[PDB]
């Protein structure tokens, strides 16, 4: 945690008040009545959105019964409540887009229905999140509102519906818009202003506690609501400045190098929601309060590009899937905002030759913003170019590639990272995007997943990462079990780190240097060690999949998904192949039926020594 | 008439001394007393459980804003009322099922229904919401009024709260809390704070209507107060308010007890006055009770007297010739006012079926039906009643003989409730079957299509002052007589026209005796009938219908013709079938003074 306070340094409440844009004059979309401008903006989205709206003309708004909320306490079931809720929010979002597209009033009745139904609900908070209320129950309490992920998005959607359709709504019956204003005030504006203690706001934050994607996600939704619904400038400045102080906590907490250490699967709602917040803040201040030019924000956006190997494969240190992806439209908008050509070309690449269409779902801001970017994203040339080395020195992630299709990810770090695996010093090797030396990634949660016994799960253990068992001992969990002297020579493509301190006293190791050198054709892996005492033989493990063969002593071949490599290992080792049948669908959906651990074992025992391994395409 | 019977029975102070607090007046066993519920329920138990089981997966129906808006757009009420009524019925059924079973199986659905109900902005019907300040058909969260629906919804919610607060609170206490707030905001507060709801009849003046809304809404509000208001001073004030309001209704209806709207309104007019008085009695430990007042007994007995048989009822004004009643209600009302006639009549209406719990959406009637079942099941069925019933202010007269003829006749005035221009008309039934009929619920409103003359060829005119004079009934002779002359306009040029009905053991004699100012155009006399109508000879008409056979003898100066009336309106064709007839009697004769005799007998 670093006190950068970038937003507070850019403006105080007095500065803010002088630059806030009132009366929603900041809104970038045409007036609902401006049919020609909607037709130009919409392009080929028009007919698609209209057709999606037509499918909802007889949509029956779904009631959520008390028992669906109660079921969270009874069994932990979330989906019983979330499925009808999300169906409603998606319908309302789609109807908004359809009515903007067509402008004939055909969807207005259903928009009005959705809005009115939404006001009658006691709360927009998810059943799993309601237990943070005073009563600690999973059922709404009509006397109290909190804000969660769902309710903020629900609120923002309602605010946009209100903004676009207030006039046709009031023609039908002005009480609808009136109740919408009341609902948004009670469920977003007031709780946001009056309750300093919502955990995601991080006003009470201290070391040890978590700040995560909830912070920019909830702040960006609240910010939209205020900018759309709060017409008192004094009240608006106070709310906006509060949001700036809150989001500063998030910016202060993440690393300046821009690596999202949970991995790419959170990126869209972490860095991507920080982007949304900053765009919204910029729009609301006529561009005068903008961090979109800050290099750290660009690095946070570019992490999604650098970490995306290809064909759905992503770098997956820690408890993260080896499969991933992104919203190309979001990535494009983020890229353009921070002037990252790399991100803009990457977004075009991720389209996979699809034409960009409006983002549907239930996120009103991203749906509307997707309309603005489509035409430009459509013209963008697809390319996934990046430097041969990306070095995140604080997070200690290192990506290194060559022009013949090898991509190596390596890490230093410490065994108390977010979603930690005991993996200090590990590497992953991809060949033409295909994992060849892999990192197994994320399994289904069990009771053992959190707490002592986390490290009894094989996916979390150094034993099942691309690492040694020093004197036969694996790495230990803990903040102080860490890399030392981690370096990256960007020009030579050499990553090096001393992993000795990631192992417990029983490992009896003074130093162990693990280094990776990538040349134009091969990856050289070296170990260089000094032990206090030679207790037991070292073991070295590699994780892989596909078709594994052993043509001769010192040689392994791996053939997987059209790629083929040879791994040369010291002949002092006896190589065995362990089959890991994958019962857990979260794993088998990525890797198929089984993966392998290659074990390299020896009878040797010495206080010093070194190993070289070489991997090349064949 | 200022009877003010409730205000005479107590003021606010004496009421406060006899009010029963803490719901100790409730006549039903505690939810947790399984054995007492099993005894009370009897054979209702298995049936109510099965009805609950059918609702275990019932999806509570949302009412969209457009359903309320549709009332303004097109006048459509059912688009809103059908899901609303389905919800209310489900909730009432689930209550009864859970009382019946007591295993907790229906509690989750009861809780769901109650919670859903609190989330609705209003319990008022779309057709009734336009009496709010804004005059719109959509709920406005800023204001609550009370209508028929909302009062019943409120009372149901109050009973659900009363029976199931403890198991609800075990699950989550916020449900019962919100129910208490909802009933306070939608029933208790508006009732006390708004003097201007039309049905309350505070500030009534001549010309305005007080109808079934008054006792119906007051009975529902009264239940909510008795169940939900535990402050004694607040309770007394609300209950006394209800007494003043219902006095307005009691003051407005005729003391003879006839419901001029007919047997179909009876259940929610007189029947809701009964409900109110039962509830008030129960809530004051029997100390404030009008159930012993003769007028209340007469109001109850109207339902028995007006029911001819086999679904056929007397149907003056805009009312159906087919009707009936809730036997369980009739029994309870009868027992409360000590009407042996009503009790036996209720058992008769069962038609040999066993009485079961009343379902629907009226919690009070459902619960009360459970109390009376075993007793009604032991009741012996009979429909006995006097040969003559005479309602002298309403001017309705029923007369029967031992050979199965039943005649209904009326005086009145052409501005009665749901008026037909029918001053002086009659209806004849034979072994319960209509033979000279009143078409019921526009040609159906015209004297032209009632059993009446067209004087100098002119029909009756609509209006308050178009009325009978000198209406008499000789109860012993079975003679009804009235002068209908003033029900006709000036151009009818009639000084007097006496229409009289004499029923003896064998025949109905109908007479017309008239004096005209001037003979302008021939009189015409009409009769309405159905079935198989023939004309065997001059002066004779034969009517054969549903197994009955009569002859109508008429003066030979008339030429009789049969006019077919095709009934395309299903509300009429579902009663009478595809067509009915008007017999017209026409003549060339014209005289200033004359008389006609008509005789109807079975052959
Ligand atoms: C129940 C609870 O409070 N859990 C806390 C954690 O929050 C969870 O974070 C998830 C996340 O951001 O991945 C949330 O998942 C996301 O939910 C939204 C709204 O329904 C949806 O749009 C996304 O698709 C979805 N993403 C998924 C599943 O990947 C989840 O709602 C939420 O409960 C919280 O992060 C941690 C902080 O330490 O504490 C838990 O107690
Ligand atoms: C629209 C309006 O305000 N109409 C006023 C009349 O009220 C109607 O009275 C009807 C009645 O008492 O018969 C009501 O019908 C009954 O409605 C209840 C509740 O929903 C239902 O349980 C009954 O079964 C039903 N009866 C039927 C169908 O026969 C109706 O809801 C109500 O609108 C009012 O009496 C007159 C008096 O002058 O004024 C009208 O404006
Ligand atoms: Zn791992
Ligand atoms: Zn009639």
Author numbering:
A (entry chain A): 18 to 635
B (entry chain B): 19 to 459, 474 to 635
What does the paper behind this entry write?
In bacteria, however, a different strategy employing a class of enzyme known as polysaccharide lyases (PL) is deployed. The three characterized PL33_1 enzymes were all from Bacteroides species inhabiting the human colon: BT4410 (BtPL33HA) and BcellWH2_04512 (BcPL33HA) are hyaluronidases from Bacteroides thetaiotaomicron VPI-5482 (B. theta) and Bacteroides cellulosilyticus WH2 (B. cell), respectively, while HMPREF1181_01744 (BsPL33Heparosan) is a heparosanase from Bacteroides stercoris CC31F (B. stercoris). The enzymes are 68% identical and contain a larger N-terminal α-helical (α/α)6 toroid domain (residues 21 to 401; BtPL33HA numbering used throughout this section unless specified) and a smaller β-sheet C-terminal domain (residues 402 to 635).
This enabled the structural characterization of a catalytically compromised variant (Y291A) of BtPL33HA in complex with a HA tetrasaccharide. The C-terminal domain possesses an extended loop region between β-strands 5 and 6 (Leu455-Leu484: BtPL33HA, and Ile464-Leu493: BcPL33HA), forming an octahedral Zn2+ coordination site [supported by anomalous X-ray diffraction data], along with the loop region between α-helices 12 and 13 from the N-terminal domain. The Zn2+ coordination site is a conserved feature in PL33. The +1 subsite, the site of catalysis, is where the majority of interactions occur. N238 interacts with the carboxylate of the +1 GlcA through its amide group, while Y291 lies ~6 Å from C5. To determine whether conformational change accompanies ligand binding, we performed a SAXS experiment with the inactive BtPL33HA Y291A mutant in the presence of a HA tetrasaccharide (this mutant displays residual activity on HA but cannot cleave tetrasaccharides).
